[PDB]
Amino acid sequence: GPSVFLFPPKPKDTLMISRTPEVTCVVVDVSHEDPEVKFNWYVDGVEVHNAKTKPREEQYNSTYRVVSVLTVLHQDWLNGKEYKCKVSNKALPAPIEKTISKAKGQPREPQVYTLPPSREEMTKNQVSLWCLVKGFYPSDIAVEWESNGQPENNYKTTPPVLDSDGSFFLYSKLTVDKSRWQQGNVFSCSVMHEALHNHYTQKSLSLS
């Protein structure tokens, strides 16, 4: 029988006024015989009508995927409104309902620190620039690196870790050719989170 999965907007989309956040309600296992699906959407319990159904997609396993998408206001999301998707179908003796919203709780401002490479790393072909981001809540966040106005893409970032004080932390690690460090290039850790001023902070790191 049909099953439903409801996904939140991307952190980046909710934090950048210049982007457009959306919630996505997915109905998998829709049968060939009863492909018709009804969507009702609710924002904190009030029905809204501006959703749009995405093109139907036939699946290798002889079922359809049906997707409804609802756009959302950044501040409705960040103020933690609850979005409810209700799915009805002939193969479903009862309508399925699903809800999401921002993780509940007081937002806390990340503290962002940059850490130079260890003196013991200085032997190696490349070195690690670290960015420690701690004391943040909720765990929705984006971390990116740049140098001289350009993205630096050779980085990996750890999953958020729940800390003993109820906030989260993570580390981001940017790997650069050691000569790029010795040359005094300034690298910057850019963090987006709701509890930062204008949702954004940048911390820089260069040879001392």
Binding site: L15, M16, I17, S18, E144, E146, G149, P151, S190, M192, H197, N198, H199, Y200
Partner: peptide, 13 residues
């Protein structure tokens, strides 16, 4: 004031 990320507008208070 505003925050930009790689030229792109993040937010303004």
């Amino acid at each position: 004031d505003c925050a930009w990320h790689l030229g792109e507008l993040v937010w303004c208070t």
